């Protein structure tokens, strides 16, 4: 059966809680107090609360039959139009989540909850779907992430002169990985190099000195990387012969 | 026209959508459902529902006058003791948001939530206030982060002897970029540079290997930080004549 | 004396915060509006706000009395078939946080929200228990943290041949730092290093350039990881005699 709470203002308390949780209408939160159990084509929700579009429901031993041999797309659906009855579920053999906005107009939300992977006569995966909160600004103690931190990336390539070539990666607008390209040729020591100047996103507060290594010897260079943007050679006087220049180095812009 | 839904306990739910949401007297939150629309000198809250201290309301069709030529802060403000009409708004000269704490004892609470700017005749340009999210200890599982996230930073600088500075900077209470200034003379490879050690919270679990190099010159150096905080040399012997050291080197501390 | 508010469906109450809020039943939320004060060896809470198991409550000129000469663990105990007074506090020897869901089964919450130190005659110090947001997946604009994010973290030796070690260590899924051992011999320029290549989870989505240092020489080398996990010497040529490589190098693998 499904227990409606949030339910007949609602709509009110409904963006209330959206807005306390940070959920759209394309997320849910859900918590499985009981396991749900799988006999045959069916998933039975023994003890499941559900939040969609701002309202509370719980699934209390509500079975979903499965179509056999596929991907199974669990569906909550709001209907505030069905007095008796708002919320029901359904198995879809694809994510149909439609975002309808429940709590300022009318028509049906549809939102995926779960996904249930079918054989011929039973279930063999379930994977629930990701509870999303949509923030703007953290301020946090600790944080522990088990999966993965997604930061700004932004890539420069710089053609510095006589020859050489930065590929610069910049990661959350402060770490810095210089990628040392192309060869060295006609330059000198503390000469600024001829070519194009870092763009600003890429320079550092201070100088930063990068070491670079000259492939197939044992020998080494580095470069100044100016606040300016500008770039000085650091390694010895280098004559007509281009020579291979190679390394990763880093920096903080902050 | 504003409805109120959060008021005339009210304090205690006022309280309570504070803590589930975390926030405190000094932001908000905040949902267009519909378009401000600026009309001359005025922003019409079309349909808006707003949190500020606890409470909910919802401005619908709620048109604030601005002045012109200036930046106008939009102010919220909770006066409980105005029983029929608890919340206004306000344009101001500045952001004066007080933080007063309306569920536990008496006052009124102001909060901007919207920065309009205006020219003589219309609107140019607004900006929505911050939503402040405080958090103590998060466990997530993943994060995407569409500005910047702000960690620790802490700095050193180190006279490790012989001539040799070393100027530290670590993030996050882990990652540490070292950057290697001043000069190197009498040592030879294997011993531990004669002045300060780095201290204790830059130190390494184990021991990093630092490449260096000298200025002007083809040559390379390294160092050892070890565990103890402590700093070895393992470049060749270096005679009387000092020679400039220079580089980026980058360690884990965990 | 304790109000009671989420109380006496309220359970049905409880699990919907719960869910809001990101808590599971082994912590909770508080907030002492006012300062909590010490008399001789007992606490009084002047006005502080919690939430456990979902159930709001206040602790108002509520006291709990302290054992001498102990860290005092003070827990909220709540017990449901206790109408008119469900939730009580209690000192004791150790955390005895139970996690005992009231909302869906019988029993007894207990939940350790402070930790309370004394001496023979008074509080010689408090410290409160963390409050942790459990979450899923976060979309936010920007984070501000205080103390420091944990982040996957994955290590791996490799035997790269020739006598080469290689010791990576991989954060974020994203940044490694390799920090080279062992000694190389009997390799050419551009030759792939006779030993494993690198595992799949460190491999680069292109070439990354790392440079060495030899140990006790003012000479250079480097290698490449290669896509596909390979590692290319591109030092000068090395003979029967082995020489000591080291340095820490660092890559983003995206």
Sequence with gaps: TIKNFTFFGSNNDGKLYMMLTGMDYRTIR????????????NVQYTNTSIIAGGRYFELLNETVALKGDSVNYIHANIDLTQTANPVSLSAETANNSNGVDINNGSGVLKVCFDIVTTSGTGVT???????????????????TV????DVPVQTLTVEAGN???????????????VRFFGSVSNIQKGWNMSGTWVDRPFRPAAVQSLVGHFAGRDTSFHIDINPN?????????IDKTPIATRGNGSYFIK
Excluded at 30 to 41: F, G, I, V
Excluded at 125 to 142: A, G, M, R, Y
Excluded at 229 to 237: E, M, P, V
């Design 229 to 237: 943007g500008s770039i000085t050679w650091w390694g010895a006087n």
């Design 163 to 177: 020859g050489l070539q930065l590929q610069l990666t910049k990661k959350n607008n402060d770490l810095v990985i």
């Design 125 to 143: 995966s379930t994977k629930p779907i990701v509870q999303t909160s949509t923030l703007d600004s953290i301020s946090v103690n600790d944080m």
């Design 146 to 149: 088990s999966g993965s931190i």
């Design 30 to 41: 859900r918590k499985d107090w009981s396991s749900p159990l799988n006999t045959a084509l």
